[PDB]
Design an enzyme around this catalytic site. Structure first.
Site, mmCIF file in Angstrom:
data_model
loop_
_atom_site.group_PDB
_atom_site.id
_atom_site.type_symbol
_atom_site.label_atom_id
_atom_site.label_comp_id
_atom_site.label_asym_id
_atom_site.label_seq_id
_atom_site.Cartn_x
_atom_site.Cartn_y
_atom_site.Cartn_z
ATOM 1 N N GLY A 31 0.768 -1.243 0.000
ATOM 2 C CA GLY A 31 0.000 0.000 0.000
ATOM 3 C C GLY A 31 0.797 1.290 0.000
ATOM 4 O O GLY A 31 1.987 1.300 -0.340
ATOM 5 N N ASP A 147 -8.536 7.115 8.532
ATOM 6 C CA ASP A 147 -8.593 6.079 7.493
ATOM 7 C C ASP A 147 -9.385 4.833 7.940
ATOM 8 O O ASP A 147 -8.930 3.698 7.757
ATOM 9 C CB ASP A 147 -7.187 5.715 6.964
ATOM 10 C CG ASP A 147 -7.181 5.204 5.534
ATOM 11 O OD1 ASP A 147 -7.711 5.909 4.649
ATOM 12 O OD2 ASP A 147 -6.635 4.107 5.300
#
Ligand code: F1B
Length: 349
Positions: A31, A147
């Site tokens: 990521g 997030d």
């Protein structure tokens, strides 16, 4: 088999590193952070995650400093941390030895969606309560995750213990100091952030949690936006057009989206028939336009929807007992201490 011996500093306690050995390394994540590995320890044979991130001399790692202050059962614990060289030795990396958890809320929710089935309300109650409990702990230090998504909510299928991960976006929010607008994953992005708010509270995680709750109830994202502006169209489709005062309450920098007045759609009609009314009541108080009107993580934990978990006769669908949900601390109860009368039942007292 290849063994990797390194000197790593433990996350908790004094800054005194120790010799830590690990084997069977494999790539499990990729990521914005860097890369996540899975390794077996030489001592107990326990499986751990290693998040390798490129680190600079200019400053210190923001995630690491948030991580080694955090100690909660519903957040992946920072076991150790070390430095390695993998770019002709001139460039150094930061490795974070964290807890390994086999599944995620996304993968579990995907299983039911692919099989045309609905996720049982007991699982929705257990996963949401544990997310708000970890949120009540992080928000007490002023830290906002920024997030919240089912991909970042780790899951153990046997014990049903939820753990929060990826604190790269996380920041200690201070009044007056501006922040970036384009944060969180689109489907879980708060309306303030779409309206360009640079000055926001940790109430953006509460909205993101509300987006997860409705997703576990519908079996698909509630606001699937094609664009950054199409995301607001998805919100307006159920919540209606926000009022003059609701817009101002979000503190919006550079507004005028130019959209027609469509008005709010009833919450009961949004979800499937025979959906528990308590889930809807909770979702209504989380997915609010006004950030100050939103329920706090502790207030969400004390909601009527999670009353089934408070029952002394409650157990997991596999026969096993429910995990530790009432072992709250003074740091967790810090925001609203008299809530302990509802949160901690007499059986666990
Ligand atoms: C991102 C972070 O900071 C972090 C920290 C600790 C972690 C993980 C991630 C993590 C992940 N585990 C997956 C392994 C593959 N299975 C099929 C699904 C779960 C994981 C990896 C990438 C994206 C999301 C989650 C884990 O087990 N421990």
């Amino acid at each position: 088999s290849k063994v990797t011996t390194v000197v790593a500093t433990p996350g908790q306690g004094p800054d005194r590193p120790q010799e830590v050995s690990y084997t069977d390394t494999k790539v499990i994540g990729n990521g914005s952070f860097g890369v996540v590995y899975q390794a077996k320890l030489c001592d107990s044979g326990e499986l751990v995650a290693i998040k390798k991130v490129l680190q600079d001399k200019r400053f210190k790692n923001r995630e690491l400093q948030i991580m080694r202050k955090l100690d909660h059962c519903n957040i992946v614990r920072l076991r150790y941390f070390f430095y390695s060289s993998g770019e002709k030795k001139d460039e150094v990396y930061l490795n974070l030895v964290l807890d390994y958890v086999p599944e995620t809320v996304y993968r579990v929710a995907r299983h039911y969606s692919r099989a045309k089935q609905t996720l049982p309300v007991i699982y929705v109650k257990l996963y949401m309560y544990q997310l708000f409990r970890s949120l009540a702990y992080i928000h007490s230090f002023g830290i906002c995750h920024r997030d919240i998504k089912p991909q970042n909510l780790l899951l153990d299928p046997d014990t049903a213990v939820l753990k929060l991960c990826d604190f790269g976006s996380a920041k200690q929010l201070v009044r007056g100091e501006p922040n970036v607008s384009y944060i969180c994953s689109r489907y879980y992005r708060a309306p303030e952030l779409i309206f360009g708010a640079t000055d926001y509270t940790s109430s953006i995680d509460v909205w993101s949690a509300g987006c997860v709750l409705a997703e576990l109830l519908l079996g698909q994202p509630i606001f699937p936006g094609d664009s950054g502006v199409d995301q607001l169209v998805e919100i307006i489709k159920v919540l209606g057009t926000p009022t003059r005062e609701q817009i101002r309450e979000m503190n919006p920098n550079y507004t005028e989206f130019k959209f027609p007045q469509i008005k709010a759609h009833p919450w009961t009609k949004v979800f499937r028939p025979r959906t528990p009314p308590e889930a809807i009541a909770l979702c209504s108080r989380l997915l609010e336009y006004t950030p100050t009107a939103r329920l706090t993580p502790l207030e969400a934990c004390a909601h009527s929807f999670f009353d089934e978990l408070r029952d002394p006769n409650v157990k997991l669908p596999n026969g096993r007992d429910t995990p530790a949900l009432f072992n709250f601390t003074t740091q967790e109860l810090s925001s609203n201490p008299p809530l302990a009368t509802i949160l901690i039942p007499p059986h666990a007292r």
